[PDB]
Amino acid sequence: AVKKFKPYTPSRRFMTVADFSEITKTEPEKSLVKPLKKTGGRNNQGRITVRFRGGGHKRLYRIIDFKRWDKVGIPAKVAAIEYDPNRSARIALLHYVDGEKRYIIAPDGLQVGQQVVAGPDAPIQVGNALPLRFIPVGTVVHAVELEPKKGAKLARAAGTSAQIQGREGDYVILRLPSGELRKVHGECYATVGAVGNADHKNIVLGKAGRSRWLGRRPHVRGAAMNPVDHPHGGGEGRAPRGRPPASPWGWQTKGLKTRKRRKPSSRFIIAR
Amino acid sequence: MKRTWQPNRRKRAKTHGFRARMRTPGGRKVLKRRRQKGRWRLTPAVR
RNA sequence: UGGGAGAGGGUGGUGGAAUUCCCGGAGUAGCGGUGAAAUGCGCAGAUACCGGGAGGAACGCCGAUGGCGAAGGCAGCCACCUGGUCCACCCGUGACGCUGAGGCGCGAAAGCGUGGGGAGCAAACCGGAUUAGAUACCCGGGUAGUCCACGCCCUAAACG
RNA sequence: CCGAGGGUAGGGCCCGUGACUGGGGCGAAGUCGUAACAAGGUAGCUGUACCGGAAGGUGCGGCUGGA
RNA sequence: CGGUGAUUGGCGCAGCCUGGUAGCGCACUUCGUUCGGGACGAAGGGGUCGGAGGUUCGAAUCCUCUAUCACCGACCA
RNA sequence: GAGCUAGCCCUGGCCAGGGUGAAGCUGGGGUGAGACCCAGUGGAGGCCCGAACCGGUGGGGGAUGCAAACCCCUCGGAUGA
RNA sequence: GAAUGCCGGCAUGAGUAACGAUAAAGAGGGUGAGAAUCCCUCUCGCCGUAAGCCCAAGGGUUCCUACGCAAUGGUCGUCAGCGUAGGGUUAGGCGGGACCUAAGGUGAAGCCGAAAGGCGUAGCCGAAGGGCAGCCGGUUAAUAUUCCGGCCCUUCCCGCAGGUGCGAUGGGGGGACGCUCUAGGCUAGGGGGACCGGAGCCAUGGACGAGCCCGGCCAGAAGCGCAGGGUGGGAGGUAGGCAAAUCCGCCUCCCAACAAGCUCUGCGUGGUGGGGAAGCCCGUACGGGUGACAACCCCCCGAAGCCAGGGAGCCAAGAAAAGCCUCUAAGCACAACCUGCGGGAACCCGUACCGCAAACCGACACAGGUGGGCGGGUGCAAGAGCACUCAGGCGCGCGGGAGAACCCUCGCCAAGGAACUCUGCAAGUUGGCCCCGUAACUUCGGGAGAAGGGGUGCUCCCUGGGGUGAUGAGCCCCGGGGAGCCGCAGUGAACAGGCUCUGGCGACUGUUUACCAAAAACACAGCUCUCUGCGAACUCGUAAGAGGAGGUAUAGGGAGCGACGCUUGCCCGGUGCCGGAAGGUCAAGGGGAGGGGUGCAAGCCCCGAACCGAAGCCCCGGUGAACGGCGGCCGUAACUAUAACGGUCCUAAGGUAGCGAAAUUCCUUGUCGGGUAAGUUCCGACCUGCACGAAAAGCGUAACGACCGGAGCGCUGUCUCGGCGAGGG
Ligand SMILES: [Mg+2]
Ligand SMILES: [Mg+2]
Ligand SMILES: [Mg+2]
Ligand SMILES: [Mg+2]
Ligand SMILES: [Mg+2]
Ligand SMILES: [Mg+2]
Ligand SMILES: [Mg+2]
Ligand SMILES: [Mg+2]
Ligand SMILES: [Mg+2]
Ligand SMILES: [Mg+2]
Ligand SMILES: [Mg+2]
Ligand SMILES: [Mg+2]
Ligand SMILES: [Mg+2]
Ligand SMILES: [Mg+2]
Ligand SMILES: [Mg+2]
Ligand SMILES: [Mg+2]
Ligand SMILES: [Mg+2]
Ligand SMILES: [Mg+2]
Ligand SMILES: [Mg+2]
Ligand SMILES: [Mg+2]
Ligand SMILES: [Mg+2]
Ligand SMILES: [Mg+2]
Ligand SMILES: [Mg+2]
Ligand SMILES: [Mg+2]
Ligand SMILES: [Mg+2]
Ligand SMILES: [Mg+2]
Ligand SMILES: [Mg+2]
Ligand SMILES: [Mg+2]
Ligand SMILES: [Mg+2]
Ligand SMILES: [Mg+2]
Ligand SMILES: [Mg+2]
Ligand SMILES: [Mg+2]
Ligand SMILES: [Mg+2]
Ligand SMILES: [Mg+2]
Ligand SMILES: [Mg+2]
Ligand SMILES: [Mg+2]
Ligand SMILES: [Mg+2]
Ligand SMILES: [Mg+2]
Ligand SMILES: [Mg+2]
Ligand SMILES: [Mg+2]
Ligand SMILES: [Mg+2]
Ligand SMILES: [Mg+2]
Ligand SMILES: [Mg+2]
Ligand SMILES: [Mg+2]
Ligand SMILES: [Mg+2]
Ligand SMILES: [Mg+2]
Ligand SMILES: [Mg+2]
Ligand SMILES: [Mg+2]
Ligand SMILES: [Mg+2]
Ligand SMILES: [Mg+2]
Ligand SMILES: [Mg+2]
Ligand SMILES: [Mg+2]
Ligand SMILES: [Mg+2]
Ligand SMILES: [Mg+2]
Ligand SMILES: [Mg+2]
Ligand SMILES: [Mg+2]
Ligand SMILES: [Mg+2]
Ligand SMILES: [Mg+2]
Ligand SMILES: [Mg+2]
Ligand SMILES: [Mg+2]
Ligand SMILES: [Mg+2]
Ligand SMILES: [Mg+2]
Ligand SMILES: [Mg+2]
Ligand SMILES: [Mg+2]
Ligand SMILES: [Mg+2]
Ligand SMILES: [Mg+2]
Ligand SMILES: [Mg+2]
Ligand SMILES: [Mg+2]
Ligand SMILES: [Mg+2]
Ligand SMILES: [Mg+2]
Ligand SMILES: [Mg+2]
Ligand SMILES: [Mg+2]
Ligand SMILES: [Mg+2]
Ligand SMILES: [Mg+2]
Ligand SMILES: [Mg+2]
Ligand SMILES: [Mg+2]
Ligand SMILES: [Mg+2]
Ligand SMILES: [Mg+2]
Ligand SMILES: [Mg+2]
Ligand SMILES: [Mg+2]
Ligand SMILES: [Mg+2]
Ligand SMILES: [Mg+2]
Ligand SMILES: [Mg+2]
Ligand SMILES: [Mg+2]
Ligand SMILES: [Mg+2]
Ligand SMILES: [Mg+2]
Ligand SMILES: [Mg+2]
Ligand SMILES: [Mg+2]
Ligand SMILES: [Mg+2]
Ligand SMILES: [Mg+2]
Ligand SMILES: [Mg+2]
Ligand SMILES: [Mg+2]
Ligand SMILES: [Mg+2]
Ligand SMILES: [Mg+2]
Ligand SMILES: [Mg+2]
Ligand SMILES: [Mg+2]
Ligand SMILES: [Mg+2]
Ligand SMILES: [Mg+2]
Ligand SMILES: [Mg+2]
Ligand SMILES: [Mg+2]
Ligand SMILES: [Mg+2]
Ligand SMILES: [Mg+2]
Ligand SMILES: [Mg+2]
Ligand SMILES: [Mg+2]
Ligand SMILES: [Mg+2]
Ligand SMILES: [Mg+2]
Ligand SMILES: [Mg+2]
Ligand SMILES: [Mg+2]
Ligand SMILES: [Mg+2]
Ligand SMILES: [Mg+2]
Ligand SMILES: [Mg+2]
Ligand SMILES: [Mg+2]
Ligand SMILES: [Mg+2]
Ligand SMILES: [Mg+2]
Ligand SMILES: [Mg+2]
Ligand SMILES: [Mg+2]
Ligand SMILES: [Mg+2]
Ligand SMILES: [Mg+2]
Ligand SMILES: [Mg+2]
Ligand SMILES: [Mg+2]
Ligand SMILES: [Mg+2]
Ligand SMILES: [Mg+2]
Ligand SMILES: [Mg+2]
Ligand SMILES: [Mg+2]
Ligand SMILES: [Mg+2]
Ligand SMILES: [Mg+2]
Ligand SMILES: [Mg+2]
Ligand SMILES: [Mg+2]
Ligand SMILES: [Mg+2]
Ligand SMILES: [Mg+2]
Ligand SMILES: [Mg+2]
Ligand SMILES: [Mg+2]
Ligand SMILES: [Mg+2]
Ligand SMILES: [Mg+2]
Ligand SMILES: [Mg+2]
Ligand SMILES: [Mg+2]
Ligand SMILES: [Mg+2]
Ligand SMILES: [Mg+2]
Ligand SMILES: [Mg+2]
Ligand SMILES: [Mg+2]
Ligand SMILES: [Mg+2]
């Protein structure tokens, strides 16, 4: 349900904003175990590290429960689906019968006023959380922990999903969104279903100002530089890179793998 | 046009201030050289 | 009113045969391919065999001069939603009917846009043969496409 | 006031013309190859897409105007 | 003007740097196939090696100078 | 030494006045339901004209100058990067 | 005696340039030894969204008074922002601190680093941000929201009086927030008035008249009145808000659905307090008195300010903590807290003066720069624009003459209009508002203000809507029709687009070489390749640590291309990258065949070959939106010419599509065609592409541009070809 714009001015024939019909009438936020002060920063203690960051709108970090083992066997009522500026996907407010109010990463197909339970019993309906060893093979899933009792760190973007393909011993194999087959411990928790907001891929920013509103500063090409600043830089007009394409620090950027070969996690991966 | 000197008592006292010099080891050597030379104003006068 | 058949259409789910690939075991000096050959693959352990895993596409037998649909077209199975049609009863309305310039909708395959998927096949393209020459026919590879969702395209030996 | 007509400015249609270029037809008996008619030596035809000096080749689907 | 590369059968190239033997393909000619031509099959001819000189027993071959041909350069003003 | 200058963080302030009338709503039309078409409303925009503000295109002056970057005319952005 | 030598002094230019904006001065009277320059008076000019007031930063005596002119003042100077001396800055309510937290700094715990030092949860610091209790007048030569006058509030502390379980740095609520557009009612501010109060005045032809001129306010408790903001009230149950809670949160039925009611602001109105023009009379630089017992009334416009945390829409999703309320905990319930009253206590620092400028930054009394608030009136459609003008403040610290050339800044011109020139450079034409009317092309928005036209002043008559008033008068804002008048001319002055055709590049808004280059350079949405499964990849750092990110393949990093439309062909021989448990080579180490040195020997000490030995390289493949490249010579067709065709050599392969004398073409002004009288430029073609070419992208593209090139119309001192006038020199 992506929205289009009439070309009354340029950079509006292509400009594209997402659909907010799934957002129920909860435009402001909840408080006290809910937004924290987002520390805006483009750098570490001093110098810049990740270049071309800065500006952008001011944000408030909505704290998300990524560890749903705190409330095993405790039901929940979904009352709101809110916007999160710090995430590509949407969030869901959960009222507990216990009384606690938490935010979960809102998955696809979740509707307001739904019964959601986490734990090992936890029947297979969207939003429920389970250990990997109790989820049936072939079902899509997201918010997967990597190691047990460490937090959901896998497949939490917009539109993403992980698929389970089998169980080997205490571990299970997963079809990650990058196509990689990974052995994950069965005791890891994961919330079933896809995350939704899959139209995030289909957004066109339209103009340059939108990129600045998201905090993305302009990206300067290396060939548009001088040799002091970049290996591609220099030369009289429009040099055709004169060498293998590398980064500003000398390492090549065309097909050079840089994964640590002796990683201990290498005996748990199968595919690319 | 806009010249170089745009005074600020806060900036002057915080950068060239006595306490700021005693923080760094390099600033402590500055005053040692000013004491040895005999400067009347070990630090810039700020009010 | 009461029955009946059917690959009629849309959605969701699901089964196995077979191909390719991955893994393990076992096992050797060749395998593919043709009219004959060659490219190609293979002691870096192939083909052939067993076992396990992933993935996609199409449903053998039934099955045909069969069936359905207005046409294009529709074929594993299951469920839901749905159209058309046939028969009997002769129950009601009572001429309400036929065609149809426009318009509107539908419309094979190939093609386009966006995203996904891609086992096999396969334009273009690369080799190896043949020929005088081969941009082909034959062989080994191989990308779009073939598949899904949505929006376009309106063509044909759309033929009885 | 209206007013023939003259003037300014901008449109619509038609005709003549124009370097060059595309395709069409007719010509002297030219060059290159063999497409289709016989199973035309790869059955042929077709819509579409791509490629090739060229007829044309191939891919997807269709027709008997073939077995 | 500079540098360096080569002129070889009718045509397109090998043979040179390690001197004594000039070869390949197309072409041409004769015969064979066809009703004929092309294709195909069998045999055959074809080169003052751009000219001049010496270097040697001996030069397509080694070395100088002209003759064209090709390519590159001619910069800072 | 970032009191000039470049970037970023935190917190405040500024942008006179006019144009254009996007989406969406209400009513009418239209359909089987639509798509869609009319008005009226609506006030969107790295939207227009143009002051404050930020610039610094072209020309003239200035050249031991008012000035170690200026002045006059002209011109750009001016709700946004 | 020399070193563009160093230091100091004095010459030259030279009585020359200059005297710091062309906003402008003249006269009279004083003081004085000495007056263009000081004081006063009259006349004139300038600013008037300031060149006038009020804050902040900065400055530190510059403020006032008296006495002075050696130096400072671009002249003088009796003057001063200067010299000497004295005086002047008064706070519970203004601002900051005994209140709070953000970025950031610091930092017990803890981690790291040869040392010095570097991180760092909690805490603290950190302010125009949040919180907090004063308004109006009067006095000084100099201060006042500080002193005084009136009215009104805030904290504590001690007491009696009345109520309640009191009670924390702990829990909860709240504080609490974006951008744009806005509703209602107020206020600030302003306009008018036949109404009210006033010293006065009929000038020069006319006017004793609702005549002219000036002024008709401010603050103000507790109440009322009018707007508006916040919020439901009970009952159970309860595992969460890291102890406990009656609080909060979550369920469940009951009553409201309202602002009814509670509070909380804002505005009237309020006890009462204060102010009070113009003109005239004076004695000062500056003010005083009267005018006056002043009046202090009614309409209209009306905010961006108030009610404020208002309403609606939208995406880019919009601070923290304390004050405040509630809740309980230990402890305490002879305490304590809440309400009311009374008495008492209420500290440190700043307060002068400049403050778009002669007091700040520019070495200067420098045409520069500098944050926030008020900023009136009239007219021009509106407006902070433009012209003039209130309040207020200035004539810019050298003048007087003359009326050369020439320079700057202006005005005008016959006839011709670009013939000037690199180019219409510059200057000129156009210019606002209302109404007609507007092409190719197109992404259907645009192009558009296309282009090109007509109207534009004043008087009279008729007539339609609103707003405020009651549906009416009046006041205000919009129209319409008709009849006339004048001038050369009616946005009568000032502010205010020249237009069009065509091409190149770039899609565009935008950014950049402060201080010669704003562009076709950069950036930009979008496309592609590649890396990265999280303690990620990458970056800073020796480390710790941090960014990435409190993100997770729709995400993050690197690279190139640069909207969009159509596309992006062949070569993996070399290089880069990717994939290959075979093989060759390969260091340390293992390994000891064997040999050597000493010993009388047990021994000790050296080398030392096979053989086992990683990555890397060699080797095998793959890979172009990776580094990169994409041929030569002969002949051949019914006239020449040409070559669809063929032969041959070589490469890893031999430039496909689409363009092409171009931002690329040397020969070259290639050759045709068009614009011209004439075109080395421009545009359309041919291709003989020295030396286009597909993501260092190719070909197109509506719109867009202080970009570049060509042409035409209008207009002109650009030119023939100059002339005259004005002012500053
Ligand atoms: Mg809080
Ligand atoms: Mg908060
Ligand atoms: Mg820090
Ligand atoms: Mg630091
Ligand atoms: Mg995409
Ligand atoms: Mg870039
Ligand atoms: Mg550069
Ligand atoms: Mg650097
Ligand atoms: Mg540098
Ligand atoms: Mg370098
Ligand atoms: Mg170059
Ligand atoms: Mg380069
Ligand atoms: Mg009957
Ligand atoms: Mg019919
Ligand atoms: Mg179709
Ligand atoms: Mg199809
Ligand atoms: Mg498709
Ligand atoms: Mg195949
Ligand atoms: Mg094949
Ligand atoms: Mg048929
Ligand atoms: Mg034939
Ligand atoms: Mg045939
Ligand atoms: Mg055929
Ligand atoms: Mg083919
Ligand atoms: Mg077929
Ligand atoms: Mg030079
Ligand atoms: Mg700064
Ligand atoms: Mg405005
Ligand atoms: Mg509308
Ligand atoms: Mg704009
Ligand atoms: Mg403008
Ligand atoms: Mg302002
Ligand atoms: Mg410039
Ligand atoms: Mg603009
Ligand atoms: Mg001397
Ligand atoms: Mg000497
Ligand atoms: Mg000198
Ligand atoms: Mg000299
Ligand atoms: Mg002199
Ligand atoms: Mg003189
Ligand atoms: Mg002189
Ligand atoms: Mg002079
Ligand atoms: Mg002066
Ligand atoms: Mg006297
Ligand atoms: Mg101060
Ligand atoms: Mg003097
Ligand atoms: Mg001076
Ligand atoms: Mg005197
Ligand atoms: Mg004074
Ligand atoms: Mg003094
Ligand atoms: Mg404090
Ligand atoms: Mg604090
Ligand atoms: Mg902090
Ligand atoms: Mg520290
Ligand atoms: Mg230490
Ligand atoms: Mg800290
Ligand atoms: Mg404050
Ligand atoms: Mg206060
Ligand atoms: Mg007082
Ligand atoms: Mg209590
Ligand atoms: Mg709290
Ligand atoms: Mg008032
Ligand atoms: Mg009045
Ligand atoms: Mg009166
Ligand atoms: Mg008279
Ligand atoms: Mg508890
Ligand atoms: Mg209500
Ligand atoms: Mg009042
Ligand atoms: Mg009151
Ligand atoms: Mg008075
Ligand atoms: Mg007076
Ligand atoms: Mg009003
Ligand atoms: Mg609101
Ligand atoms: Mg605190
Ligand atoms: Mg004061
Ligand atoms: Mg003061
Ligand atoms: Mg100001
Ligand atoms: Mg000073
Ligand atoms: Mg000064
Ligand atoms: Mg002065
Ligand atoms: Mg100044
Ligand atoms: Mg300013
Ligand atoms: Mg104002
Ligand atoms: Mg105003
Ligand atoms: Mg004014
Ligand atoms: Mg007005
Ligand atoms: Mg106006
Ligand atoms: Mg003005
Ligand atoms: Mg005045
Ligand atoms: Mg002056
Ligand atoms: Mg005149
Ligand atoms: Mg003239
Ligand atoms: Mg004239
Ligand atoms: Mg003329
Ligand atoms: Mg010209
Ligand atoms: Mg000329
Ligand atoms: Mg001339
Ligand atoms: Mg001009
Ligand atoms: Mg145009
Ligand atoms: Mg116009
Ligand atoms: Mg007239
Ligand atoms: Mg204009
Ligand atoms: Mg142009
Ligand atoms: Mg243009
Ligand atoms: Mg541009
Ligand atoms: Mg510059
Ligand atoms: Mg700049
Ligand atoms: Mg410079
Ligand atoms: Mg693109
Ligand atoms: Mg390091
Ligand atoms: Mg980290
Ligand atoms: Mg972070
Ligand atoms: Mg990336
Ligand atoms: Mg580029
Ligand atoms: Mg290659
Ligand atoms: Mg390679
Ligand atoms: Mg290779
Ligand atoms: Mg490798
Ligand atoms: Mg050894
Ligand atoms: Mg060794
Ligand atoms: Mg050894
Ligand atoms: Mg190795
Ligand atoms: Mg390519
Ligand atoms: Mg001939
Ligand atoms: Mg040309
Ligand atoms: Mg040309
Ligand atoms: Mg070229
Ligand atoms: Mg001509
Ligand atoms: Mg002509
Ligand atoms: Mg010509
Ligand atoms: Mg050409
Ligand atoms: Mg190029
Ligand atoms: Mg390239
Ligand atoms: Mg480009
Ligand atoms: Mg082009
Ligand atoms: Mg382009
Ligand atoms: Mg264009
Ligand atoms: Mg621009
Ligand atoms: Mg021109
Ligand atoms: Mg003159
Ligand atoms: Mg004059």
Numbering used by the authors:
A (entry chain RD): 2 to 273
B (entry chain R7): 1 to 47
Show the paper's wording:
The m1G37 modification also prevents the ribosome from shifting out of the three-nucleotide mRNA codon frame (‘frameshifting’) to ensure the correct polypeptide is expressed. The absence of m1G37 in tRNAPro causes high levels of +1 frameshifting on so-called ‘slippery’ or polynucleotide mRNA sequences where four nucleotides encode for a single proline codon. To address this question, here we solved six 70S structures of tRNAPro-CGG in the presence or absence of the m1G37 modification and bound to either cognate or slippery codons in the P site. We further show that ribosomes bound to mRNA-tRNA pairs that result in +1 frameshifts promoted by tRNAPro-CGG result in large conformational changes of the 30S head domain, consequently biasing the tRNA-mRNA pair toward the E site.
Although the m1G37 modification was previously shown to be critical for high-affinity binding and decoding of the cognate CCG codon at the A site, its influence on the overall conformation of tRNAPro-CGG in the P site appears to be minimal as the tRNA adopts a P/P orientation. Notably, the mRNA remains in the 0 frame with three Watson–Crick base-pair interactions between the codon and the anticodon. The mRNA has clear phosphate density for the single A-site nucleotide indicating the mRNA remains in the 0 frame. The absence of the m1G37 modification correlates with a slightly weaker U32-A38 pairing when compared to modified tRNAPro-CGG.
